[PDB]
Amino acid sequence: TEFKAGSAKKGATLFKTRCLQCHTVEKGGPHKVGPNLHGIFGRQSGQAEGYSYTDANIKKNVLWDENNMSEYLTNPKKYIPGTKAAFGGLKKEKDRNDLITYLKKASE
Ligand code: HEM
Ligand SMILES: [C-]#N
Protein backbone atom coordinates (compact mmCIF):
# COMPACT_ATOMS: atom_id res chain seq x y z
CA THR A 1 0.00 0.00 0.00
CA GLU A 2 1.24 3.57 -0.62
CA PHE A 3 -0.32 5.37 2.37
CA LYS A 4 1.63 5.02 5.64
CA ALA A 5 -0.26 5.47 8.87
CA GLY A 6 -0.69 8.36 11.34
CA SER A 7 -2.03 6.90 14.58
CA ALA A 8 -4.17 3.81 15.36
CA LYS A 9 -5.58 5.53 18.44
CA LYS A 10 -7.27 8.98 17.97
CA GLY A 11 -8.59 7.68 14.63
CA ALA A 12 -10.77 5.46 16.85
CA THR A 13 -12.25 8.58 18.51
CA LEU A 14 -12.92 10.12 15.10
CA PHE A 15 -14.60 6.92 13.82
CA LYS A 16 -16.61 6.77 17.06
CA THR A 17 -17.86 10.36 16.60
CA ARG A 18 -18.28 10.31 12.75
CA CYS A 19 -18.76 6.87 11.23
CA LEU A 20 -19.92 4.69 14.17
CA GLN A 21 -23.20 6.65 13.91
CA CYS A 22 -24.14 4.74 10.73
CA HIS A 23 -21.52 1.94 10.46
CA THR A 24 -19.71 -0.70 12.49
CA VAL A 25 -16.07 -1.96 12.38
CA GLU A 26 -16.57 -5.32 14.19
CA LYS A 27 -16.51 -8.70 12.39
CA GLY A 28 -19.69 -9.03 10.30
CA GLY A 29 -21.42 -6.35 12.41
CA PRO A 30 -24.92 -4.81 12.08
CA HIS A 31 -25.38 -3.09 8.70
CA LYS A 32 -27.23 -0.31 10.57
CA VAL A 33 -27.57 2.69 8.22
CA GLY A 34 -24.37 1.89 6.33
CA PRO A 35 -22.80 -1.56 5.80
CA ASN A 36 -20.04 -2.93 8.07
CA LEU A 37 -16.41 -1.86 7.43
CA HIS A 38 -14.46 -5.01 8.45
CA GLY A 39 -11.84 -6.28 5.93
CA ILE A 40 -12.98 -3.60 3.42
CA PHE A 41 -9.34 -2.54 2.94
CA GLY A 42 -8.38 -4.55 -0.15
CA ARG A 43 -11.89 -6.01 -0.70
CA GLN A 44 -13.76 -4.45 -3.62
CA SER A 45 -16.89 -2.40 -3.05
CA GLY A 46 -20.19 -4.13 -2.48
CA GLN A 47 -18.81 -7.12 -0.45
CA ALA A 48 -21.72 -7.62 2.05
CA GLU A 49 -24.84 -9.45 0.79
CA GLY A 50 -28.35 -9.21 2.32
CA TYR A 51 -28.07 -5.53 3.31
CA SER A 52 -29.73 -2.91 1.04
CA TYR A 53 -27.08 -2.49 -1.69
CA THR A 54 -27.17 -0.35 -4.88
CA ASP A 55 -26.56 -0.98 -8.60
CA ALA A 56 -24.44 2.16 -8.50
CA ASN A 57 -22.00 0.76 -5.89
CA ILE A 58 -21.65 -2.45 -7.99
CA LYS A 59 -21.18 -0.56 -11.30
CA LYS A 60 -18.77 1.79 -9.48
CA ASN A 61 -16.68 -1.26 -8.34
CA VAL A 62 -13.96 0.31 -6.12
CA LEU A 63 -11.04 -1.60 -4.51
CA TRP A 64 -11.24 0.38 -1.22
CA ASP A 65 -7.61 1.35 -0.99
CA GLU A 66 -6.69 4.43 1.09
CA ASN A 67 -6.77 6.87 -1.87
CA ASN A 68 -10.16 5.80 -3.17
CA MET A 69 -11.66 5.72 0.34
CA SER A 70 -10.02 9.10 1.17
CA GLU A 71 -11.65 10.59 -1.95
CA TYR A 72 -15.03 8.81 -1.53
CA LEU A 73 -15.32 10.07 2.07
CA THR A 74 -14.99 13.65 0.77
CA ASN A 75 -18.01 13.23 -1.54
CA PRO A 76 -19.65 9.79 -1.29
CA LYS A 77 -22.81 10.68 -3.23
CA LYS A 78 -20.59 12.01 -6.07
CA TYR A 79 -18.00 9.21 -6.09
CA ILE A 80 -20.84 6.63 -6.12
CA PRO A 81 -23.80 8.16 -8.07
CA GLY A 82 -26.42 6.15 -6.13
CA THR A 83 -25.90 5.82 -2.37
CA LYS A 84 -28.16 6.25 0.67
CA ALA A 85 -25.03 7.64 2.43
CA ALA A 86 -26.47 11.04 3.45
CA PHE A 87 -23.10 11.74 5.13
CA GLY A 88 -21.51 15.17 5.65
CA GLY A 89 -18.55 14.56 3.27
CA LEU A 90 -15.33 14.55 5.35
CA LYS A 91 -13.93 18.06 4.68
CA LYS A 92 -11.49 18.18 7.66
CA GLU A 93 -8.67 16.45 5.64
CA LYS A 94 -6.35 16.09 8.65
CA ASP A 95 -8.46 13.96 11.04
CA ARG A 96 -9.14 11.76 7.98
CA ASN A 97 -5.48 10.61 8.13
CA ASP A 98 -5.97 9.27 11.67
CA LEU A 99 -9.46 7.93 10.92
CA ILE A 100 -8.21 6.06 7.80
CA THR A 101 -5.26 4.78 9.89
CA TYR A 102 -7.66 3.38 12.52
CA LEU A 103 -9.92 1.91 9.81
CA LYS A 104 -6.94 0.34 7.97
CA LYS A 105 -5.69 -1.12 11.29
CA ALA A 106 -9.16 -2.35 12.29
CA SER A 107 -9.66 -3.77 8.76
CA GLU A 108 -6.37 -5.71 8.79
C1 HEM B 1 -16.21 9.34 8.21
C2 HEM B 1 -17.02 8.18 8.75
C3 HEM B 1 -17.46 7.23 7.66
C4 HEM B 1 -16.67 6.32 6.98
C5 HEM B 1 -15.22 6.01 7.30
C6 HEM B 1 -17.50 5.67 5.99
C7 HEM B 1 -17.05 4.71 5.06
C8 HEM B 1 -17.87 4.09 4.09
C9 HEM B 1 -17.43 3.15 3.09
C10 HEM B 1 -16.02 2.65 2.87
C11 HEM B 1 -18.53 2.76 2.35
C12 HEM B 1 -18.52 1.77 1.19
C13 HEM B 1 -19.11 0.37 1.49
C14 HEM B 1 -18.85 -0.67 0.38
O1 HEM B 1 -18.73 -0.28 -0.80
O2 HEM B 1 -18.76 -1.86 0.73
C15 HEM B 1 -19.67 3.45 2.90
C16 HEM B 1 -20.98 3.26 2.48
C17 HEM B 1 -22.09 3.80 3.14
N1 HEM B 1 -22.11 4.69 4.18
FE1 HEM B 1 -20.43 5.45 5.16
N2 HEM B 1 -18.77 6.15 6.15
C18 HEM B 1 -18.80 7.10 7.14
C19 HEM B 1 -19.90 7.80 7.63
C20 HEM B 1 -21.22 7.55 7.25
C21 HEM B 1 -22.36 8.13 7.91
C22 HEM B 1 -22.32 8.94 9.18
C23 HEM B 1 -23.48 7.56 7.33
C24 HEM B 1 -24.91 7.68 7.85
C25 HEM B 1 -25.55 9.06 7.69
C26 HEM B 1 -23.03 6.64 6.31
C27 HEM B 1 -23.86 5.84 5.52
C28 HEM B 1 -23.40 4.96 4.54
C29 HEM B 1 -24.27 4.16 3.71
C30 HEM B 1 -25.78 4.11 3.80
C31 HEM B 1 -23.46 3.45 2.84
C32 HEM B 1 -23.88 2.54 1.72
C33 HEM B 1 -23.80 3.28 0.38
C34 HEM B 1 -23.79 2.37 -0.84
O3 HEM B 1 -22.98 1.42 -0.85
O4 HEM B 1 -24.57 2.68 -1.77
N3 HEM B 1 -21.67 6.67 6.31
N4 HEM B 1 -19.22 4.25 3.92
C1 LIG C 1 -20.30 6.85 3.95
N1 LIG C 1 -20.21 7.84 3.18
UniProtKB/Swiss-Prot annotation:
SUPFAM superfamilies: Cytochrome c
Binding of heme c, residues: C19, C22, H23, A85
Reported impact of K77R: Loss of methylation by CTM1
Pfam families for this protein: Cytochrom_C
One of the GO BP terms on file: mitochondrial electron transport, ubiquinol to cytochrome c
Cofactor: heme c
Cofactor binding description: Binds 1 heme c group covalently per subunit.
Modified residues (N6,N6,N6-trimethyllysine): K77, K78
Location of the protein in the cell: Mitochondrion intermembrane space
Main localization (coarse): mitochondrion
One cellular component (GO) term of this entry: mitochondrion
Keywords for this protein: Electron transport, Heme, Iron, Metal-binding, Methylation, Mitochondrion, Respiratory chain, Transport
Induction statement: By oxygen at the level of transcription. Expression drops rapidly when the oxygen concentration falls below 0.5 uM O(2).
Domain of life, source organism: Eukaryota
Cell division recorded as keyword: no
GO molecular function, one term: heme binding
Post-translational modifications: Methylation may enhance its transport into mitochondria. Methylation occurs in fungi, plants, and some protozoa, but not in animals. The precise role of methylation at Lys-78 is unknown, but it seems to preclude pro-apoptotic activity, possibly by lowering affinity for APAF1.
InterPro entries: Cyt_c-like_dom, Cyt_c-like_dom_sf, Cyt_c_1A/1B
Miscellaneous field: Present with 7330 molecules/cell in log phase SD medium.
Family that this chain belongs to: Belongs to the cytochrome c family.
Protein role: Electron carrier protein. The oxidized form of the cytochrome c heme group can accept an electron from the heme group of the cytochrome c1 subunit of ubiquinol-cytochrome c oxidoreductase. Cytochrome c then transfers this electron to the dinuclear copper A center (CU(A)) of the COX2 subunit of cytochrome oxidase, the final protein carrier in the mitochondrial electron-transport chain. Isoform 1 (CYC1) is the predominant cytochrome c during aerobic/normoxic growth.
Protein name per Swiss-Prot or TrEMBL: Cytochrome c isoform 1
Gene that this polypeptide is encoded by: CYC1
